[PDB]
Symmetry: D2
Subunit: 162 residues, 4 copies
């Protein structure tokens, strides 16, 4: 059998070709040349040096029971949860802010929720760490949703006036 | 239905009791009061404050396709792979050394392999970072497997002599 | 000069010995054979293979402005702050509980504060994750500080009685 | 003294204004309203909620002995070393590839070194994980520096020909 240590093989009938069957854990493919789902690397050096298959590294921000969580070759996370994003689920989705590495799911990424009347050009994204939205003149609040004390007419859509 | 948002329920016949069926993702149990496998927390505050279920945090040193990787309540990792160990797969098994957080599986934890003739009291464990074994007099090497230059008789089991 | 690339040296007068002076960043010592404070490794392979000096890895739980934060050879963290502890400031001090890796200093490690009247054998340590103290009969609360509903006399020091 | 617990203060002569002097560790400023260098947060809630000052979180890819390693308000890493980059020194500089989180400084980020004759449009950047450069027709190698077996003339600057 043209398969790694442990792998048994089978002569398929539907085309008459041999394929590996008990590929070592972490690898898959007809020759156990691919990494299994949930893993990434290049077990047989098919595309560069040999890279042992290892579990995806997505800062624990992926569903353990989902499939296709990461690119089997590069390790790029594909199914980041909790509104996280980035190559390794280490950023927040655009329009969100917080700390993707915060251990409690609720504290990872919260929506910017920028008030459209007070935010410059009605932007939907805010500072990624503080969440501060970019406010029009004399508007205040993280979401730019209220006028500064003594100013009025937020709905002017151009800042508050005295 | 006495179940969280989304969960449907079913009146079982075999005892005539209702149980939840479409528990929100991450939770499980007849009332979706437990965290699903691969997750940990306390969704309904059954044993302390409410703790949203989150994927186990085992420094990516657990098989994504195994079950029971961590304690569903505390998050303690139970099935650490690559010879890693510790509460969160952040140490190496006893008798191993290296860096459990090293990204390549081969560089995480290697066996001490202390030479029994040169190691003090025939110990099997070595320094967890350097891997240095504790050597008898005039013995050298990480594994204490050879005499210092000019000394002889390692098999004396008491160090080399001149 | 018997010193690495860049290092200049000086013939000291007080004993008449040469010593290196502009050791490359991260290293120190008369021959730049040690790693500088805040770093760990073995730049010249003086005690095993060459290990480039790198900043201590203490999960950001060390004072950036303190000295001696980690062992210059092994990297073992020595001055863990915020009540954190363990080889790499990845555990909580004994008698504390929480998540040493929690990003907010206040959420890392909190004191067990076990009530001495309700805790078994007056223990001071609690579960490292939940903080639950070990309670005597019919005593409840994380700190074991109150009787179960309908029980009395916590100060009995043996659990509450009906 | 208009200063936090522990801080003493001084009436300066050069303008006659009081300023705090023994600010609690991690904070600084005339009112201990700023986080000290090497730290980030908002101790007194001067720009949003109170955020305890904590050491910069730059994946240990910053010089412990440098100043201004991170933004005192947001925590954005400013002086990433070892060719690392990104908000938290968690990417590699452009034109580099590897794993910024690799514990050995040498394995973090290596230069793409794309061969200009074999790389498409003479690009200098390569795949961030594999380092593979984008090669012209019939050119091979990570750096696109040699022709496929049986092809010739790499210096054509358009791929090799048979």
């Amino acid at each position: 059998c043209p398969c790694p240590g442990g792998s048994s093989c089978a002569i398929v009938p539907k085309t008459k070709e041999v394929v590996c069957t008990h590929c070592p854990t972490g690898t898959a493919g007809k020759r156990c040349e691919l990494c299994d789902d949930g893993y990434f690397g290049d077990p047989l050096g098919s595309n560069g040096p040999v890279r042992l298959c290892r579990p995806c590294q997505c800062n624990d921000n992926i569903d353990p029971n989902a499939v296709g969580n990461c690119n089997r070759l590069t390790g790029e996370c594909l199914k980041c949860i909790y509104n996280t994003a980035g190559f390794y689920c280490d950023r927040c989705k655009e329009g969100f802010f917080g700390n993707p590495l915060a251990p409690n799911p609720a504290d990872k990424c919260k929506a910017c929720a920028c008030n459209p009347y007070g935010t410059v050009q009605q932007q939907s994204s805010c500072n990624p760490v503080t969440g501060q939205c970019q406010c029009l003149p004399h508007v205040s609040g993280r979401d730019c949703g209220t006028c500064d004390p003594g100013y009025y007419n937020l709905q002017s859509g151009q800042g508050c006036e005295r």
